[PDB]
């Protein structure tokens, strides 16, 4: 059974944040072997700390660790955008196994904002005569790499046939996602307006089309 | 140091799989082994280790009996063999190095039998990983659509342009634009897994509004799993 870990914690750049990794007598609380990893988007798992508190070759003095009985704690003092990513605890066990916490999603806030740029294509004709149609909204040029995306069919919420991907960086060092609206052709005739709604920081960014429109 | 993952592929439930892991860099018959896996979208899960002379193994309790660690060190080669597959197993496997070294006490280095390392109890060298994909779903082509660009997809100087790559399996299919001719203000999204098990993704490429009816924009989509390729023409809207 993995150990447990907060599913997110964030904050601001210059401060102190701390993820904790609560374990049992036969694996975190029972030995001072507990290490920490650093993912970054697309990457493999990197070590921050090991053995507890101990810092490997190399490793930033930013990062520090500890542990209380059954519970692990990973401290990063002066946050960086650069800290931004997934963190694993790992500990070895009774058993002489080894096992990995639920991970924890660290997110530096009050970066630099880019707004996004937002692009929504209607139903292909072809499509249509397959007697399908998708609603195709692609969000660009983001950042942080946070985003909210809602769809509308004329002015009513809409959840089903939605499907949208997690963001991910551009090379540009940008972020990038997209989201599908699956319809039947009579629901697609069946509404004046379907709309792609972009949330980002507080604002969000609204495309619209509509099946009269060509 | 250097770990390279191989013989990861989309196979069916119930089906085989061998995964290789060529290591390099140091002594390969000194060092305990790991395999570690990570499904997509979701947390690390340590799946075997393997001691550095293969006397000993351990496995996950979520795959014993089923996934199998081993080792061949006159080829310096982990291997993890995958028997039974279910979807859960649907990942991406990370060969992955025990740091270790010798032990120390009275003033003395100590190694285990035959100067084997002890494990200093983490991780220090991965790979980049193989990919592994456990689906009933059946290998399909891609439906190519085109995304027209209008008076709607402008900005100003500048206009977008795509195709809707639709309802294929398995990953990857990869998408060009012009054969290759024109690679900027191009972008390809990843793919959307839904929930019918087939996958969808966009390409778009960003051009000169004014050269729409003019010249030509052909995406060249390629899925290589079901032997497929799709050169799509995208004519421009009168909107
Ligand atoms: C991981 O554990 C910490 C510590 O929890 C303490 O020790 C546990 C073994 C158990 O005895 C708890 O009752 C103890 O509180 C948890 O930290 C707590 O976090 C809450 C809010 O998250 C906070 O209000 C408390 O002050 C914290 N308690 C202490 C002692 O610091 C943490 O929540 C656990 N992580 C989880 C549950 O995801």
């Known amino acids: 059974s993995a150990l447990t870990q907060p599913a997110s914690v964030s904050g601001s750049p210059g401060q102190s944040i701390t993820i904790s990794c609560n374990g049992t007598?036969?694996?975190?609380?029972?030995?001072?072997?507990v290490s920490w990893y650093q993912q970054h988007p697309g990457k493999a798992p990197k070590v921050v700390i090991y053995?507890?508190?101990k810092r490997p070759s190399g490793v930033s003095n930013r990062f520090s660790g500890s542990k209380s009985g059954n519970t692990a704690s990973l401290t990063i003092s002066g946050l960086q955008a650069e800290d931004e990513g997934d963190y694993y605890c790992?500990?070895?066990?009774?058993?002489?196994?080894?096992?990995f916490g639920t991970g924890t999603k660290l997110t530096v806030l009050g970066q630099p904002k880019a707004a996004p740029s937002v692009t929504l294509f209607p139903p292909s004709s072809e499509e249509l005569q397959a007697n399908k149609a998708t609603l195709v909204c692609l969000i660009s040029d983001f950042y942080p790499g946070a985003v909210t995306v809602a769809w509308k069919a004329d002015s009513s919420p809409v959840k089903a046939g939605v499907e949208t991907t997690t963001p991910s960086k551009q090379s540009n060092n940008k972020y990038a996602a997209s989201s599908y609206l699956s319809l039947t052709p009579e629901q697609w005739k069946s509404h004046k307006s379907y709309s792609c709604q972009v949330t980002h920081e507080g604002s969000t960014v609204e495309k619209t089309v509509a099946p009269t429109e060509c | 140091q250097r770990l390279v993952e191989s013989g990861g592929g989309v196979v069916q439930p119930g089906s085989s799989l061998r995964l290789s892991c060529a290591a390099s860099?140091?002594?390969?018959?000194?060092?305990?082994m790991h395999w570690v896996r990570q499904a997509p979208g979701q947390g690390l899960e340590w799946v075997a280790f393997?001691?550095?002379?293969?006397?000993?193994?351990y496995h996950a309790d979520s795959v014993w009996g089923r996934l199998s660690i081993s080792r061949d060190n006159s080829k310096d080669t982990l291997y993890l063999q995958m028997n039974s597959l279910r979807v859960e197993d649907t990942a991406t496997y990370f060969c992955?190095?025990?740091?270790?070294?010798?032990?120390?006490?009275?003033?003395?280095?100590?190694?285990?039998?035959?100067?084997?390392?002890?494990?200093?109890?983490?991780?220090?060298?991965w790979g980049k990983g193989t990919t592994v994909t456990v689906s009933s779903a059946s290998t399909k082509g891609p439906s190519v659509f085109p995304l027209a660009p209008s008076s709607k997809s402008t900005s100003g100087g500048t206009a977008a342009l795509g195709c809707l790559v639709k309802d294929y399996f398995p990953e990857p299919v990869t998408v060009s634009w012009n054969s290759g001719a024109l690679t900027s203000g191009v972008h390809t999204f990843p793919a959307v897994l839904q929930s019918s098990g087939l996958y969808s993704l966009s390409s778009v490429v960003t051009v000169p509004s004014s050269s729409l009816g003019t010249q030509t924009y052909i995406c060249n989509v390629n899925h290589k799993p079901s032997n497929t390729k799709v050169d799509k023409k995208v004519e421009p809207k009168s909107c």
């Open positions: 992955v190095r025990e740091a270790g070294g010798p032990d120390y006490r009275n003033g003395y280095y100590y190694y285990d039998f035959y100067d084997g390392y002890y494990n200093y109890h983490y991780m220090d060298v």
């Open positions: 860099g140091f002594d390969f018959s000194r060092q305990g």
């Open positions: 393997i001691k550095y002379d293969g006397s000993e193994k």
């Open positions: 007598s036969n694996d975190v609380g029972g030995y001072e072997s």
């Open positions: 053995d507890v508190s």
């Open positions: 790992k500990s070895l066990t009774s058993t002489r196994r080894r096992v």
